[PDB]
Design a protein around this ligand. Structure first.
Ligand code: BCL
Ligand SMILES: CC[C@H]1c2cc3[nH]c4c(c3C)C(=O)[C@H](C(=O)OC)c4c3nc(cc4[nH]c(cc(n2)[C@@H]1C)c(C(C)=O)c4C)[C@@H](C)[C@@H]3CCC(=O)OC/C=C(\C)CCC[C@H](C)CCC[C@H](C)CCCC(C)C
Ligand SMILES: CC[C@H]1c2cc3[nH]c4c(c3C)C(=O)[C@H](C(=O)OC)c4c3nc(cc4[nH]c(cc(n2)[C@@H]1C)c(C(C)=O)c4C)[C@@H](C)[C@@H]3CCC(=O)OC/C=C(\C)CCC[C@H](C)CCC[C@H](C)CCCC(C)C
Ligand SMILES: COC1=C(OC)C(=O)C(C/C=C(\C)CC/C=C(\C)CC/C=C(\C)CC/C=C(/C)CC/C=C(\C)CC/C=C(\C)CC/C=C(\C)CC/C=C(\C)CC/C=C(\C)CCC=C(C)C)=C(C)C1=O
Ligand SMILES: CCCCCCCCCCCCCCCCCCCC(=O)O[C@H](COC(=O)CCCCCCCCCCCCCC)COP(=O)(O)OCCN
Ligand SMILES: COC(C)(C)C/C=C/C(C)=C/C=C/C(C)=C/C=C/C(C)=C/C=C/C=C(C)/C=C/C=C(\C)CC/C=C(\C)CCC=C(C)C
Ligand SMILES: COC(C)(C)C/C=C/C(C)=C/C=C/C(C)=C/C=C/C(C)=C/C=C/C=C(C)/C=C/C=C(\C)CC/C=C(\C)CCC=C(C)C
Ligand SMILES: COC(C)(C)C/C=C/C(C)=C/C=C/C(C)=C/C=C/C(C)=C/C=C/C=C(C)/C=C/C=C(\C)CC/C=C(\C)CCC=C(C)C
Ligand SMILES: COC(C)(C)C/C=C/C(C)=C/C=C/C(C)=C/C=C/C(C)=C/C=C/C=C(C)/C=C/C=C(\C)CC/C=C(\C)CCC=C(C)C
Ligand SMILES: COC(C)(C)C/C=C/C(C)=C/C=C/C(C)=C/C=C/C(C)=C/C=C\C=C(C)\C=C\C=C(/C)CC/C=C(\C)CCC=C(C)C
Ligand SMILES: CCCCCCCCCCCCO[C@@H]1O[C@H](CO)[C@@H](O[C@H]2O[C@H](CO)[C@@H](O)[C@H](O)[C@H]2O)[C@H](O)[C@H]1O
Ligand SMILES: CCCCCCCCCCCCO[C@@H]1O[C@H](CO)[C@@H](O[C@H]2O[C@H](CO)[C@@H](O)[C@H](O)[C@H]2O)[C@H](O)[C@H]1O
Ligand SMILES: CCCCCCCCCCCCO[C@@H]1O[C@H](CO)[C@@H](O[C@H]2O[C@H](CO)[C@@H](O)[C@H](O)[C@H]2O)[C@H](O)[C@H]1O
Ligand SMILES: [Fe+3]
Lengths: 281, 43, 54, 248, 306, 54, 43, 54, 43, 54, 43, 54, 43, 54
């Protein structure tokens, strides 16, 4: 089945690999070469997660976990039961994510649109690799990565965040959090503004981009414009992920102590380092 | 007054049926309350 | 009280009915849960104690 | 602390989490139905409605009142691609590409597709043309950045196709929407600015080869552009990424 | 290279737009401010006018009092030393009264009463600002969507500062007015209640924050990818669907198996954003008042090994 | 105080009726909850203690 | 005046119905308060 | 009571029917799980102990 | 009224079938409740 | 002060009425809260201790 | 003339009814304050 | 001091009246709170001590 | 000047009634201040 | 000195007046709080100590 306007777009071309071997649609999905690759990797990863569940001895979805190898294996292999299944599933997950991005590239080419979406997805992929490849290798052990469990990977997060004190004092963490929070705020504002313009008070005429510009100038004395708001949303999300991967690439590689002591450098500035009075005086 | 499209005449039967339902509901509720209060009171 | 029917010239009957339904169901489950929380009104535990079921 | 459980381990937090599961199911249902107001019902590749329509029912119609008496738009409703879509299905079975029968860049299919939008100009909140050329606008000037007027325009084959003459700007947005380009024959074609690389000495266009700017659709008026014309121009220009590709 | 439409390569400036007026009271309106070329490289370079009604001025006055009260207390903590004030600015704090005062207003000014005063100021300011957003939507005849989206964050704020301290019976529970003081309040809140990670509503709030980031990356990338077809003009694509809306729909139709519309994606967006603070407020409200150890609770509800 | 009918020349009945319904329900629930919090007024516990239901 | 779009007579009759409902609610409130006060006074 | 059929002049029957189905199913599952939680009314455990399957 | 766009006799027939199904459901419910109450009463 | 009426010609009556209603509710609840917080005027605990309920 | 588009006579009537309401509310407040101050003074 | 009236010709009466009301309310609340803050002036606690209340 | 352009008689009456209210408020405040100082002076 | 009328021929009276009122209020409250900070100028503290209120 197709949407009422789909048929004029379902034309050949745009595929990076193949070109007619894997140029078709299964239901709504576009299957390409990378569609085949991503389906294989994802199916393997899911089946191996279930298999690791039966090896773990639990069928609670929230208790299933797939741990990486211990710190003793360094950056080497591991038996499937110890940390090998996690390494295979990391292979499958990386392959699936990359194949998904390249399949999106093919879809972009076939629709004649920009490649903003696969690029923005590559940002998330590189954050994932920062957590499972870059930081572990720069640290030297696959056991510094997180397990594949719903609540055990939060255990990884908590233990790592407390290995360095209160992680709130990481400054890259601070800018990443500010980006995340302002991105959520921007998304709320954008959704609300567009819905308010498209849906008027009651039984009256639809509003215009000038009307929403007017509303936000009457609210906060400014409006960024409909192209600017989408620019800002993409930038906020991508930069939040970038400084997230930044806060976790300098942590345990450049800074090793409690991050709070970082903020000492400012209070020990020689001009006012030794003034009596205040919080730290 | 007819903001909802009602014409003040079928609203009468609508209210009659709604009050019938409300009073049947309250009768069953009173039966349940009395049965529980006999079972054990709260005052 | 002889002019309460004008409530249907007040609000959309569908909206009032659905709000009433959700309101009443939420109240009913809340009250039943409150009673079940208190040991003196948990009829399951009471009936277990009376018949020495546990 | 009210840590008391009504039954089992079901405390107030459990009540909250299950209430949120119910609410989230309802909200996802609502959000999906609100997003089925375009392109529905689904159709077979021959245009007839398909056997399957999805687990989500279509929503009730809603009416938008366009600001300037343009009419009331009710969605969902009957739909039709009221234009000559020129494609032939490559396979008898479903789910295979439809090959273009002719020149796809000219027929308006695939990445060159266009939508039969209203053939009326875009009206702002003041009831005036939202977009008008630089001359038509009163007081608008290039406030900053490169001024792309008189610059040569170089196609994807690296041959000049024309020179930029004017910029069409947006009145309530103050955004530079279109570049007007004159070819060898003295006629003007519009170019969306999202497709042009405005360098210091030229305005490059990677989408189109030099011998395609004349194939860009034209405009019935030289000062007002309608949504249909804008869609045709944009579709044609963006179709050159796939179709004008073989000529570098 | 190939242009990506992330920065405007050409800027254009014209008459100052004073905006429309459906039921707007023109008297309160300001006049257009300057124009920012740097900020115009990213969006509308125009600044102003600003509407200043009655709830607006109330909000401005109350917020001025709140911020200024915090500032005066910060100066007091500095010993009135400007050098200290610029040295210990982050480490300052207008803390709430200590727990032995409970909810009582009988706390010394230096011992949390000033916090009560500033909290009153901020409460009044934020509620008047919510009324302001609702009224500004009302004047232009627009829907009240921004008001309710604001009410979600307002509820999280009220839980953090007002409702939860009342339920716990002490102002000591509330968040201080400091930079690292409220960071420390956050970390200590997690530690006291036993790994807030196992709060299901903290997990939901994080799910919707991650989802907001994912959804805005997706939507921004989608609109920029179809901006070559006039995808930015979302309202007109709603009124008169173009090739931009259809290509955006079909990209996600062929990627994910389902898609949104030019209007319903913003319903997705607003709900994804407001669920963050809705679930967060619920989770903070349950912490301490209902659950004091979230990891033990998790153990009792699956979620963790026994 | 018998000439208050003029309120409906100012305030829409639609607004006031729904807003006051929500207001009255919320205040009623709040007061009932405050009473439930105070041990001297938790009527469930008073009835449990008075009738030796432990 | 008349922002509600109601004439004087409609307003008067609507007010009469509303005051009937308000007095009914107030009477039930007085009854409940009296019962609670005699059962367990708060003064 | 006789003219309750008028209900089908206010709501679409399909919406009511699907709402009733999900409401009834959720309520039934909730009550079955409540009984399962209480050891007094866990018929599985009653059959286990009554027939000494432990 | 007339929101649903149904005639009175169509609503009559639909309600007749619905009440048949409702009474069948409630009858099965009563039989099951009585059986368990005999097996294990909760009062 | 016999001429206080004409202020209604300056401010919108609906505005004034809704603002003053919100203000009255907020002031009333704030004063009630202050009195509830202080041990001297918390009437619930007064009736608990005075009637020897606690 | 003014801002709200009202006259003086309707302003007089509105002021009268608002003052009646204000006096009633303030009188109930005075009675309540007397009752409480007799019950438990704060001076 | 016989010429201030013309400020009402340079200041909008609605704006200035709202500003004055907001300012007076905020100032009064702040001063009452400061008085409650000082242990020598909190009238609730003063009367609690003088009348020997908890 | 004349941003509002209010006729001088209107401004005169507005200022007169505003000052009437201000004097009333200041008188009540003075009475309350005297009462507070007599009850418990700060000087 | 007797020429300061020419500042208002360019400045806006409304903006100047509102800004100066806000600035004066902020200065006054800042100074009052400064005096309340120093125990040698905390009049409430001084009166509490003189009359033995603590
Ligand atoms: C060690 C610390 C704990 C932890 C302790 C807490 C605590 C405590 C809280 C959270 C909360 C949250 N946590 Mg946590 N959290 C932890 C780890 C994480 C991790 C992670 C990867 O480890 C993530 C992604 C998160 C993410 C989140 C968010 C989803 C959520 C915050 C919502 C929000 O945006 O509020 C930001 C928005 C507001 C607070 C409201 C602001 C709006 C109002 C109106 C402000 C008005 C502005 C005013 C008028 C003017 C402003 C001043 C000027 C700008 C100068 N947490 C660890 C386990 N977390 C919050 C929550 O609700 O979760 C249950 C919360 O209270
Ligand atoms: C970079 C900015 C943000 C972003 C953007 C973004 N995400 C994207 C995109 C973009 C632009 C897409 O185009 C793509 C998409 O299709 O979206 C629907 C996508 C996507 N982002 C997704 C999720 C996602 N994004 C996240 C975050 C973010 N995405 C950033 C905040 C998160 C977080 C924070 O947790 C999640 C969970 C998917 C919905 C989708 C990509 C789907 C995909 O990869 O498809 C192929 C693979 C599968 C269908 C399944 C693979 C399964 C594995 C083989 C096994 C499991 C391995 C895994 C390690 C298990 C771990 C479990 C535990 C951690 C609990
Ligand atoms: C859905 C949840 C997300 C969210 C949503 C959200 N926030 C919102 C909204 C929404 C929907 C609004 O509508 C509202 C708004 O107005 O946004 C612009 C707002 C808002 N969210 C804000 C902040 C904010 N939101 C946050 C978070 C979030 N908001 C969530 C992530 C956070 C975080 C992460 O902590 C912050 C800090 C504000 C920008 C705004 C509410 C502003 C407000 O209420 O202001 C009141 C004023 C004060 C208390 C202090 C004012 C300080 C000034 C210095 C006073 C003096 C001004 C001066 C006199 C001006 C002079 C001007 C002249 C020279 C012209
Ligand atoms: C304004 O503009 C915009 C829009 O609109 C105009 C939009 O809309 C959107 C999009 C936004 C939304 C719709 C809002 C909602 C979105 C979110 C909340 C974001 C998160 C989304 C999700 C979690 C949804 C689910 C996502 C994923 C990744 C699931 C994807 C599904 C699969 C993995 C299936 C993939 C199938 C492939 C590749 C085919 C493989 C084929 C083969 C190997 C051969 C054939 C195989 C088979 C026959 C197997 C069986 C069939 C298949 C393939 C599938 C069915 C069976 C299964 C077992 C799965 C945006 C941003 C927008 O801004
Ligand atoms: C904000 C609130 C939500 C926050 C995030 C929580 C989870 C998000 C879930 C999003 C909705 C899931 C999909 C709904 C639509 C759907 O089922 O689409 C079908 C494919 O589903 C799929 O492919 C489903 C994949 C689910 C993965 C998890 C095809 O549906 P269709 O295209 O036929 O359209 C409907 C015609 N009735
Ligand atoms: C913490 O405090 C707690 C929660 C413990 C205590 C607090 C308790 C509180 C606040 C309780 C509040 C209770 C209230 C306000 C209860 C109100 C109940 C009411 C008004 C119930 C009304 C029910 C009405 C019913 C059930 C009517 C049913 C009608 C039918 C079933 C028939 C349907 C007929 C129709 C639709 C008419 C069709 C006719 C035509 C002509 C179309
Ligand atoms: C923190 O502070 C605490 C909570 C401790 C204490 C503070 C308490 C406070 C501040 C309490 C304030 C309480 C107040 C102000 C309560 C006011 C309650 C009122 C005014 C209730 C009024 C109820 C009126 C009702 C329910 C009237 C209902 C009328 C009907 C049902 C009649 C039906 C109407 C029809 C049919 C419309 C007629 C239409 C036409 C066209 C004839
Ligand atoms: C922390 O500090 C504490 C709280 C301890 C101490 C602070 C105390 C403070 C700041 C107290 C402030 C008190 C103030 C300013 C109180 C002011 C109270 C007022 C002005 C109350 C006025 C009430 C007026 C009422 C209730 C009027 C009712 C009028 C009617 C019901 C008539 C209805 C007619 C209408 C609505 C229009 C129809 C008329 C026509 C001609 C269509
Ligand atoms: C930490 O540092 C401390 C605070 C300890 C020490 C620092 C102190 C500092 C820096 C102090 C700074 C003080 C300054 C700069 C004070 C300036 C004061 C001034 C210039 C005050 C002027 C006030 C003018 C007033 C109050 C005029 C009021 C006028 C009216 C109320 C009449 C209304 C106006 C009318 C009616 C105009 C009518 C005419 C027409 C055409 C309508
Ligand atoms: C040179 O500097 C000057 C003096 C000119 C001005 C500078 C001021 C500065 C540097 C200010 C710094 C301010 C900062 C850093 C503020 C930080 C604020 C933060 C981080 C706040 C975080 C959370 C705050 C929350 C959640 C507050 C919530 C408050 C409420 C929800 C309302 C509370 C209402 C209460 C407690 C009851 C109010 C009612 C009465 C009757 C008191
Ligand atoms: C994709 C290929 C990934 C290969 O990565 C490797 O995979 C195998 C399973 O194939 C894992 O583990 C498996 O083989 C290793 C090495 O031969 C054996 O010691 C072990 O008995 C088995 O569990 C490795 O620990 C992992 O490093
Ligand atoms: C998910 C959306 C639909 C929700 C279901 C519809 C009904 C909504 C209310 C149902 C709430 C009851 O749901 C039920 O709660 C009981 C409370 O002990 C849980 O309890 C059970 O598991 C827990 C956790 O492992 C055990 O500690 C406990 O001994 C056992 O009784 C059930 O696992 C759960 O299924
Ligand atoms: C709108 C919200 C305002 C209304 C809130 C209603 C409940 C108010 C809190 C309960 C009253 C205070 O309860 C009292 O608190 C003080 C400390 O402050 C302590 O008094 C000992 C005890 O904790 C308790 O007896
Ligand atoms: Fe958008």
């Amino acid at each position: 089945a197709l949407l009422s306007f789909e048929r004029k777009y379902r034309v050949p071309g745009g595929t990076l690999v193949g070109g007619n071997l894997f140029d078709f649609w299964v239901g709504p999905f576009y299957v390409g070469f990378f569609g085949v690759a991503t389906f294989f990797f994802a199916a393997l990863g899911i089946i191996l997660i279930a298999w690791s569940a039966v090896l773990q001895g639990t069928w609670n979805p929230q208790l299933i976990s797939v741990y990486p190898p211990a710190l003793e294996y360094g950056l080497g292999g591991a038996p499937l039961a110890k940390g090998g299944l996690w390494q295979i599933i990391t292979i499958c997950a990386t392959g699936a994510f990359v194949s998904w991005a390249l399949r999106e590239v093919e879809i972009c080419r076939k629709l004649g649109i920009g490649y903003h979406i696969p690029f923005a997805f590559a940002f998330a992929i590189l954050a994932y690799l920062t957590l499972v490849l870059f930081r572990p290798v720069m640290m030297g052990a696959w056991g510094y990565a997180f397990p594949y469990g719903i609540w055990t990977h939060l255990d990884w997060v908590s233990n790592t965040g407390y290995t360095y004190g209160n992680f709130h004092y990481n400054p890259a963490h601070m800018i990443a959090i500010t980006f995340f929070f302002t991105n959520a705020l921007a998304l709320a504002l954008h959704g609300a503004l567009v819905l308010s313009a498209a849906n008027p008070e009651k039984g009256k005429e639809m509003r215009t981009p000038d009307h929403e510009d007017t509303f936000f100038r009457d609210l906060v004395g400014y409006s960024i414009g409909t192209l600017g708001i989408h620019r800002l949303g993409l930038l906020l999300s991508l930069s939040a992920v970038f400084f997230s991967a930044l806060c976790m690439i300098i942590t345990g590689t450049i800074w090793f102590d409690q991050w709070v002591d970082w903020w000492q450098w400012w209070v020990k500035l020689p001009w006012w380092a030794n003034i009596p009075g205040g919080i730290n005086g | 007054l007819g903001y909802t499209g009602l014409t003040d005449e079928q609203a009468q039967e609508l209210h009659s049926v709604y009050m019938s339902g409300l009073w049947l509901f309250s009768a069953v509720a009173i039966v349940a309350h009395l049965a529980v209060y006999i079972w054990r009171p709260w005052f | 009280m002889s002019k309460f029917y004008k409530i249907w010239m007040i609000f959309d009957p569908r909206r009032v009915f659905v709000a009433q339904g959700v309101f009443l169901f939420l109240l009913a489950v809340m009250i039943h849960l409150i009673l079940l929380s208190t040991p003196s009104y948990n009829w399951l535990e009471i009936s277990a104690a009376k018949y020495n079921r546990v | 602390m009210v840590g008391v459980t009504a039954f089992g381990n079901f405390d107030l937090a459990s009540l909250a989490i299950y209430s949120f599961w119910i609410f989230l199911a309802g909200l996802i249902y609502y959000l999906q139905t609100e997003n089925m107001r375009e392109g529905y019902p689904l159709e077979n590749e021959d245009g007839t409605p398909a056997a399957n329509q999805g687990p989500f029912p279509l929503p009730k119609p809603k009416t938008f009142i366009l600001p300037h008496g343009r009419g009331t738009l009710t969605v969902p409703g009957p739909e039709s691609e009221d234009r000559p879509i020129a494609l032939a299905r490559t396979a008898v079975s479903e789910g295979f590409p439809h090959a273009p029968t002719g020149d796809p860049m000219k027929d308006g299919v695939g990445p060159a597709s266009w939508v039969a939008r209203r053939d009326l100009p875009e009206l702002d909140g003041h009831g005036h043309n939202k977009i008008k050329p630089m001359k038509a606008a009163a007081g608008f000037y290039v406030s900053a950045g490169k001024n792309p007027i008189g610059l040569p325009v170089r196609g994807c084959d690296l041959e000049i196709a024309g020179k930029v003459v004017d910029i069409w700007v947006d009145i309530p947005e103050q955004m530079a929407r279109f570049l007007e380009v004159e070819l060898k024959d003295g006629s003007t074609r519009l170019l969306p600015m999202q497709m042009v690389k405005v360098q210091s000495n030229r305005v490059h266009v990677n989408a189109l080869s030099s011998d395609l700017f004349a194939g860009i659709p034209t405009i019935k008026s030289p000062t007002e552009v309608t949504l249909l014309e804008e869609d045709k121009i944009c579709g044609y220009v963006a179709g050159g990424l796939m179709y004008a590709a073989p000529k570098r | 290279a190939e242009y990506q439409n992330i920065f405007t390569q050409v800027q254009v400036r014209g008459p100052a737009d004073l905006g429309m007026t459906e039921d707007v009271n023109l008297a309160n309106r300001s006049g257009v401010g300057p124009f920012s070329t740097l900020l115009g490289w990213f969006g509308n370079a125009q600044l102003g006018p600003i509407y200043l009604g009655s709830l607006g001025v109330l909000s401005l006055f109350s917020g001025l009092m709140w911020f200024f009260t915090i500032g005066i207390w910060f100066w007091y903590q500095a010993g009135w030393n400007p050098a200290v004030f610029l040295r210990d600015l982050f480490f300052f704090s207008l803390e709430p009264p200590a727990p032995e005062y409970g909810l009582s207003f009988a706390a010394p000014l230096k011992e949390g009463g000033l916090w009560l005063i500033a909290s009153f100021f901020m409460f009044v300011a934020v509620w008047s600002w919510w009324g302001r957003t609702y009224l500004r939507a009302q004047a232009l005849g627009m829907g009240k969507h921004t008001a309710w989206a604001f009410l979600s964050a307002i509820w999280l704020w009220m839980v953090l500062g007002f409702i939860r301290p009342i339920l716990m019976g002490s102002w000591s529970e509330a968040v201080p007015y400091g930079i690292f003081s409220h960071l420390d309040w956050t970390n200590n809140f997690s530690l006291v209640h036993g790994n807030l990670f196992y709060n299901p509503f903290h997990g939901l709030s994080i799910a919707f924050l991650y989802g907001s980031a994912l959804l805005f990356a997706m939507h921004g990338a989608t609109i920029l990818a179809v901006s070559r077809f006039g995808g930015e003009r979302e309202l007109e694509q709603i009124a008169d669907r173009g090739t931009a809306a259809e290509r955006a729909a079909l990209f996600w139709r062929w990627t994910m198996g389902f898609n949104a519309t030019m209007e319903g994606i913003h319903r997705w967006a607003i709900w994804m954003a407001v669920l963050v603070t809705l679930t967060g407020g619920i989770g903070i409200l349950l912490s301490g008042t209902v659950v004091d150890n979230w990891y033990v609770w998790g153990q009792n509800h699956g979620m963790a090994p026994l």
